[model samples]
Target: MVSKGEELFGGIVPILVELEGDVNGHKFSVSGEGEGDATYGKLTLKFICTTGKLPVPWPTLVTTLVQCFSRYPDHMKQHDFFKSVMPEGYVQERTIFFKDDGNYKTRAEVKFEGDTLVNRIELKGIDFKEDGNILGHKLEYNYISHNVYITADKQKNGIKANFKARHNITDGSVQLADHYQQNTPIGDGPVILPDNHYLSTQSALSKDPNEKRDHMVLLEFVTAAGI
Candidate 1:
C-alpha cells in the first residue's frame, strides 16, 4: 500500500533533453527521453541516448548534466530556472542511469549537503577497436571510468558545476607475429574536460601520432516538456 503523499508525488514524469557537441572532431547530435519520480526522500531518473555518434564508443558527454537535473524539487526550486521546470518539495537522495544503444551504461549517485549537491558517476563496459593494426599488431581498447565526481549548486542566477574523473584502461591487447599475444594499457590517467574548452590529444590506439583528437562538451538547459 502507498501513502497519500507517495501517491501524489511518486508517479513518473517524462523528461526530454537535446544535446549537440563533438568528440575528437566527430559531430554528435542526440535526444534523450526518460521517466523520473520523486517519492518520500528519494528521487530516481533513467534515460538512454537513443541517437548519436562520437569518436568514443559510448555517450559519456552528458553524464553530469543529467545528474544536475536529478536534484530534489526543494533544491531545484531554490533556483528560478529550475523552479520553473521541476516539481515542488525537497528530496534527500537521488540516483540516475544513462545507457546507449548498446551495452554501454553510466550510473550516477547524488547526495545533498546544505546548498551543495555532490554526485559520483561511473561508466562501464565500453570497448573500441582500431581500424587497422599498429606496427603489424592488432589492438583493442577498453575503458572503465571509475570515478566521475562532481559538485554543483545555485550560483547567483545560474548553477555552477565542477567535474573530475579517474579514467582506467581496464583491458587492452596487441596481437603480435606467430600468434603472439601482448597486453597493452594506454591512456590510463586523470581526464579533465573543462567547461567550454576543447581538450586535444592523440588517440593512443591510432597508428599515426599526427592524427588530431579534439573534444569539447558544454551543457545547456533547454525548455522542459510534459507528455
Candidate 2:
C-alpha cells in the first residue's frame, strides 16, 4: 500500500516476512523484519521448529528460502551479502560418527564449499524396528559456525622485525591448545605454545654500539566477537 509519495524517499520503510508450514510432518515457522529503501535493503530471519524437529538439515531449508525469495528482488542477483552468507555452488558434506560422554553413539555432519562453511547438523539417537526396519532419528541441533582468523606483524621505521602473530576464534572460550610454529630461522623448529599467543621483536637503534641487541616477546590474549 502506498501511504504517501514523499515517504518513499523520506527514510527506511519497515518490512516484515512471516511464514508457517510443515515439512515431513514437522511444523515450523519463520518470522523476521528488516528495512528497505530505494537503493538498498537488509533482512535478518529466524527459523523456529514447532515440532522441535526437522526432517532435513537447516542449511537445506535456508537454501530453498533464498532461492524462492531471490526472484522478487532484482538487486539480489549481485548482492554481496547473499554471496558470502549462502553462496551457490557445489557443496561438500562430511559426516562423523562418534560416542558422547555417556558412551552413547551419535552422528554429526558439516556442509561446506571450499573454505566457506554452509551448515552443521547433529543427530542424537536413532530408533530401529524389531523387524529389522529402520526408524527415524532425532535432530539434536542444526547451526552454522563462524570462523575467523587474525594475523599481526611488527615493523618500525625502515626496518622490519621478524615478529608475527595469529589467533583463532575459539581461543576465548576454551583452554589454548598446543600449536607448532613452522620452520623459522630462530629458536627450535617445533615448540609447545598456546594457540592464542603472539610473538614480537623489539629493536632500538642508536649511534652507540653498546645498545646493539635484539629482544623478542611472546604474549597471549583473548578474542571476542563483533557485529
Candidate 3:
C-alpha cells in the first residue's frame, strides 16, 4: 500500500552517498584498537562531504540539510545532528500507537526533467496542516564561521532529545557531480575505535540477560552525554 505521502512522490528514491572534502582526517579519528590512551579526550572538527542516493521520500530530511548548508557556509565543523521525539501515550501499557507520532502529514510535489528530479515543498511551516493533524516544530539550522546552531522544541509527553552537529556544504554541489558521474556513493566505514572503547551505532544495545545493569543510571548517562 502506498503511504499518503508516497502517492504524491514517485514511490521511494534511493539516497546513496559518497563522502569527500574536510570530513576525513586524523581529527575525526580517535585512535586504533592497538593504540594507547595518549590522545584520549582530544578531538577535532571535521567536515563530511558525500554524494548520497536519496532515501525514500522525506524531502525535508534531505532538503533541510542542503538548504541549511547553502544558506550558511562553513557549517560542517562539529555540526549537523538530529533529535529523537517519541510521544507519550503513543507507547503505553505494552502496545504502540503512532496517533501522535504521525500527527503531521507531509505535502509536496515532484518534477522530473529528463532523468533529474526536483521536489518542491508547498506546505512545510507549522501553519500548514494536512488532514486532521497539526504540524510540529521544525528543524532549524544556522551557521556563522565555524559555529553552527540547530534547534527543535520539545514535544508534549515525549523525550525530545536534540543533538548539535555541522551541516556545511562547501562546494558540495560540485563535489556531488563528480560522485554521481562515478556511478556509486563514496565514503569510508565507521571510524576505527580504541580497543574496548564504547562505540555507538544506530542499533540499540541489548542488555546482558545474565549481567546486571542499572536503568536509572543509564538514563542519567544518556542525559549527560547529550547524544
TM-scores for all candidates? 0.34, 0.24, 0.16
Winning model by lDDT: 1
Residue-pair clashes, model 2:
0
TM-score of 3: 0.16
Candidate 2: regions farther than 4 A off: 1-10, 63-227
Displacement of residue 81 (Cα, Å) in model 2 is: 22
Clashing pairs in 2: none
lDDT tens string, model 2, 1-227?
A: 22222223234434333334343334444443333332232223333443444443333222222111111133222221112222221121112111120111212121223432222322222232222111122221222222222121112101111211121122232111111111111221221111222221111111223422221111111121121
Cα lDDT, all candidates: 0.28, 0.24, 0.18
Q: Candidate 1 residues 1-227, lDDT tens each?
A: 22222233344444444444332234444444343343222223222343332444322333332322422333222222222222222222222221111122333333332332333333332222233232112223322222222223323222332222222222443222111111111123211221221111111211224423332223222221110
- For model 3, the stretches where C-alpha displacement exceeds 4 angstroms are 1-156, 172-227
User: Using TM-score as the measure, which candidate wins?
Assistant: 1
lDDT of 1 at 27: 46
Q: Ten-residue segment with the worst summed lDDT in candidate 2?
A: 156-165
When 1 and 3 are scored with lDDT, the better candidate is: 1
Clashes of each: 1, 0, 19
lDDT of 1 at 160: 32
